[PDB]
Amino acid sequence: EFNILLATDSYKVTHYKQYPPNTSKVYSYFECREKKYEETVFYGLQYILNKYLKGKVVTKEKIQEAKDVYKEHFQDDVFNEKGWNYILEKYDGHLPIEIKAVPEGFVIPRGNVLFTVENTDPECYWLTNWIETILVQSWYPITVATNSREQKKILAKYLLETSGNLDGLEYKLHDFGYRGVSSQETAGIGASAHLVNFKGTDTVAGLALIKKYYGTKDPVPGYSVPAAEHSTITAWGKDHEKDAFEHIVTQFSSVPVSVVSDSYDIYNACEKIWGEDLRHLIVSRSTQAPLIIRPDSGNPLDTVLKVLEILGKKFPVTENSKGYKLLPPYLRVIQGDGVDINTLQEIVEGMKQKMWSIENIAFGSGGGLLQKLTRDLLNCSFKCSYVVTNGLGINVFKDPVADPNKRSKKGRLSLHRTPAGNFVTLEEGKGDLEEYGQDLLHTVFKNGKVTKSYSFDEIRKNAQLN
Amino acid sequence: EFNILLATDSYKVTHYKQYPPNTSKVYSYFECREKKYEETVFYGLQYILNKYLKGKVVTKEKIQEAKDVYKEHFQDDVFNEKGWNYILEKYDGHLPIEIKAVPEGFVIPRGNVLFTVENTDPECYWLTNWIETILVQSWYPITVATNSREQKKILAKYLLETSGNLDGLEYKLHDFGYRGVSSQETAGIGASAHLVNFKGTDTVAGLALIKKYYGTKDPVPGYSVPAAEHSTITAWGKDHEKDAFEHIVTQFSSVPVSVVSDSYDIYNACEKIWGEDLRHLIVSRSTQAPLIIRPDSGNPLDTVLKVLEILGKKFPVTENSKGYKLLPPYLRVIQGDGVDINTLQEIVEGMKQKMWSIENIAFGSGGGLLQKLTRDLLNCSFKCSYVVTNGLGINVFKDPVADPNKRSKKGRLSLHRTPAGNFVTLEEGKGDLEEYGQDLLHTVFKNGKVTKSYSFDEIRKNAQLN
């Protein structure tokens, strides 16, 4: 069972002895500090609130467990047993904390407050930053959701330019990241963050998380199709790639099927096997059930172009109203190797220059989508901005001399729409002047209860492209 | 409840209809493919076997749950209900799988078999590659352990050169990665992997994982010390940094204490506050209770060197037996900002050139230690190498034309010691010839049971530096 007393950075166990005496309030905030990612999707907090923070999170046994561990960990009894016991006795183990957050799915420019944390009981001044560690981990679903949306922007731009519409955009970037992430829990979190923007996923874990923590009107938030891997092709033996190909497309004749084609020779597979030997099984396919040829090696741009070049000469290629080449509806290509935001841009641009419609191509991304991201990409940061000491509120901040970018905000914070319809974070409690509209930060957690939640449908709506 | 039927890549649900008819055996292996990072620490499989793979992992409820999810996920009844029911009825939900692996903590050159997977029942040919996704996630603890060890190699080289010994090496790289990782589960896995090489950690989750899945003779595998953060300094107010400093060091006067000193001006804090105003509280401290000054901004190397020069002028610096400058034992520095394998090397080399002993410095790493790593850093891959179809064993492999590095191994595999005492992976069942010694892989999993285990003490011993 999870223990919140053991879910913090070790040194935070010693911080209750470090704050100024007579401190009754610690007030902190999360932002993606200003530095290619000018706006961020806020997503993932509701998961953390429900799974880890809500209800009775302190028990008699959990306090003793923590006390025993930290005694050995520090070689000293520094642990605040008395502080945690107070929470157990007075609030039945419910956290006297208030969390206010911008609605999930909201797209917010960098350098704005996204959520705030404060203690609601003066005895628990130390608790605000105790939970920094668990809350800051929201950086990940935020960053995955943001990076995924930015890739959608690129896909949208090129799809619209090369085809004149956005049909099937929500299926142009497929999550292949399950094996390439660091854990089962990460897989589910990351997969769900991608599903804010897209509907194609192989990371099943993401579906259960959305169902449990967010909810959607549809039975499932994400979908997939039958697909081959190298084991299902190579198990037939090198001399029998054609038989493997034939068997798989015949098995999945009435649904879309993706078939990895680079086991031995991708260019041979497209020209000779797909383009000649088994052509008759491809041209007879439905528009609802295309063959999706999947290269999986070589230079991503060069390989996609060569594959399209080969297929264009073996199958009846048309030219759409924008003047771009289009494969027949029963045949498509998915690039699922070496795909990240940079190579995605590189491929669609190379395709456009060679006059190929983005209709022809879909993308798959694993590590690039769910793993090759850090807390530093969006400068995700949690800092104390306000304390009450001796009954007086003081605006607090860091401002390192050698890095002005690390300067933090002062005082009590609020988020507002500007008259031109942008966003502004007001500092030093200036939001109380009512010069702007309503504070966009809403109480989502208070004293052990989740007070406002959003469905996954609402989140998708909020995170739409312009 | 974790459901193994929902813990695979979506397309693997469709693979039982893709293998050649009358396939009785699927045999696959894991390696870190060849072409820094020339050898890998094998760590983390035991965790996966115990948490996810062992015992009764199939129930009737879990089969129905998966059936209903995949029905909506594929918009089709492609899920292998009968295959999974067979396992439940015949084996009481235990996986008919055998896994052979190198001992954990073992240091193996790239391009060698690390573990193999095969089905023990002909009916369950499809199960071998079903569990690929779960098992491939071992890339992460392997990569953390390996990258951590490579950093220890760098630290050892410079500590030995500047001081003449390796005292306290195991405390020179501290885990700060809790908030910087993608999930709670990743935090535990990654922290445990770092603890294979070092003993300092702030990521508490790592302790419980080790004690549950590996075990150590000591009460805890990892330790920490009291330390300040920006909130516990800045809360005092801009004009009261000295008061913050004084309070914290006097509260923790008998243990080591780390104090972040860059809230407003790092060079002012070192020269005027530590070096003048509070010098009397530093020079009185025990050798077992040093002040550890923590810069946290600016250029990592330039800041460390400037901090050291400042302290050198305010404090009684000595010269060690190797001719390098050494701060008094009550005074140390920790650089915990922007630390990864590359910048660690830069700092210790830069220190050496300015004649500063590595005794003076410790490092902390967060994202660089536990997050900024991917599956392709060590080329971690899981591939089928051998199948039995129509009673005949067939050597299986991929060899893509445009990437010869992606070529996989053929047939039944075994790991051996060479006459010169190195490692060799023999292919095509050639290990049966016994021209080398016995196969060095052990059966670690068979038919739902963990059959071989290693304590965390064994692993640490296996993974030590030469």
Ligand SMILES: O=P(O)(O)OC[C@H]1O[C@H](OP(=O)(O)OP(=O)(O)O)[C@H](O)[C@@H]1O
């Ligand atoms: O973007 P990524 O994180 O790489 O994930 C996508 C890739 O992962 C799989 O490769 P596989 O597991 O066979 O690894 P390998 O290609 O390195 O052998 C799959 O064949 C995709 O090409």
Ligand SMILES: O=P(O)(O)OC[C@H]1O[C@H](OP(=O)(O)OP(=O)(O)O)[C@H](O)[C@@H]1O
């Ligand atoms: O190696 P990393 O992943 O950066 O983690 C380590 C850093 O994290 C903490 O800063 P904080 O959480 O305040 O982040 P910030 O300095 O970017 O605000 C700490 O002060 C370290 O500098």
